Amino acid sequence: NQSAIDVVAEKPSVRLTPTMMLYSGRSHLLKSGRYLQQELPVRIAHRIKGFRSLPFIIGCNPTILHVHELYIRAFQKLTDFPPIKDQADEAQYCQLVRQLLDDHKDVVTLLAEGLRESRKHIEDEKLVRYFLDKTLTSRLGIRMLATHHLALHEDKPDFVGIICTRLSPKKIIEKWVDFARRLCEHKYGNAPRVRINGHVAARFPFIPMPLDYILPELLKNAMRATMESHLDTPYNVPDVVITIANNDVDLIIRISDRGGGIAHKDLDRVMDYHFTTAFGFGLPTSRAYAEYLGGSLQLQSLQGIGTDVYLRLRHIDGREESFRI
């Protein structure tokens, strides 16, 4: 809790849209590196401010305290590093960014553990939701900016940093379907087949990074629900049907399962952090990530039949607003 953190804790974020980054990703690495150097300490200070504002009994949890202390250590490193003048200065910063990206890889796990240890002192799940939605999405934003900058140094086909210039939703969904079906097959001996329909030929600019979190979570929920509701017929289960709708405004991905649905008693709890019928972070984090990206995650439960999950995400066309929750 030093005075340097206090100076930028209330300072507004200078937000850049993926379009702005795509135009620079066409001298431009120096302007980009300068932005990160000045903007990342502000984002880290906003996270520290969040920990400072937690109720005392929650902030005292040594696991919560440890994540708070990790963010203070990251602010110290980001500010104590000298400014960027030449290209070798921009390159020295990339190495610090690589190190901080790895030191904070398990923050969400530690935060879930801290939340769990403090369950008896909560009483307001809406306040837990605001803290975690803001912390995890601001963390997503920091990781996206940091990873994009590292990836700008590379000349990877169909990528401008972490922006895929021709992302196919069908291919990204197919990659995670194969990943999910294998885990499900190892647990139940079988997995539902996944059919993909709609705008299967869609290709457009998109950052796959948040879809790499959302898609396995939603597929795992759909497949586990399907298997749990058909234990008496486990080698003859209904397919999971994924429809892609692509238009000028947004991308919609509907994941429809025949997994029995979300019961009426659980319906208002599934979106709370740590609520589970088996981690409990899959749905509320996916919803927060979709909101951060200018979209949404909505559920329609048909109790006794199955669930329809709608993931809506905005395009990158020079019309989109900046990412924020």
* List of residues contacting ligand WIH (CB under 6 A): 15-16, 18, 21, 40, 54-55, 58, 64, 74, 78, 97, 100-101, 104, 107, 114-115, 118, 122, 124, 127-128, 131, 139, 141-146, 148, 161-163, 207, 323
Check binding of 221 to K ion (CB under 5 A): no
Q: Enumerate residues 264-283 that contact ligand ADP by CB under 6 A.
A: 266, 270, 275-283
* 275 assigned binding-site residue: yes
Check binding of 298 to ligand ADP (CB under 6 A): no
Q: How far is the CB of 285 from Mg ion (least distance, A)?
A: 9
* 280 assigned binding-site residue: yes
225 binds, among K ion, its own copies, ligand ADP, none (CB under 5 to 8 A by kind): ligand ADP
How many CB atoms are located within 10 Å of the residue 319 CB?
Answer: 11
Q: Enumerate residues 236-295 that contact Mg ion by CB under 5 A.
A: 282
Residue from 84, 173, 262, 283 that binds K ion (CB under 5 A)? 283
Check binding of 250 to its own copies (CB under 8 A): yes
221 binds, among K ion, ligand ADP, ligand WIH, none (CB under 5 to 8 A by kind): ligand ADP
**Could you tell me if 170 and 204 are in contact, meaning their C-beta atoms sit under 8 angstroms apart?**
no
* 246 assigned binding-site residue: no
With CA atoms as reference, report the closest residue to 180 among 216, 226, 222.
216
* Residue 72 DSSP one-character state: H
Residue from 210, 259, 261, 280 that binds its own copies (CB under 8 A)? 261
* 141 assigned binding-site residue: no
CA 158 to the chain's CA centroid: 22
Q: Which helix (H) or strand (E) holds 191?
A: none
Question: What is the DSSP track for 198-224?
Answer: ESTT--EEE--TTHHHHHHHHHHHHHH
Q: Enumerate residues 56-85 that contact ligand ADP by CB under 6 A.
A: none
Own/partner contacts of 50-55, CB < 8 Å, gap of 24 or more, are: 50/131, 50/134, 50/135, 52/1, 54/131, 55/121
Determine what percent of the chain falls in helix, strand and coil, rounding each to the nearest 5: 50, 15, 35
Contacts of 98 (CB under 8 A, 6+ apart): 150
The length of the chain is: 325
* 277 assigned binding-site residue: yes
Contacts of 33 (CB under 8 A, 6+ apart): 84, 89, 90, 93, 94, 149
With CA atoms as reference, report the closest residue to 110 among 136, 134, 129.
136
* 165 assigned binding-site residue: no
Residue from 39, 275, 294, 320 that binds K ion (CB under 5 A)? 275
- Which residues of this protein are in contact with ligand ADP, per CB under 6 A? 217, 221-222, 225, 257, 259, 262, 266, 270, 275-284, 307
- Which residues of this protein are in contact with K ion, per CB under 5 A? 275, 280, 283
Which residues fall in the annotated binding site? 221, 257, 270, 272, 275-277, 280, 283
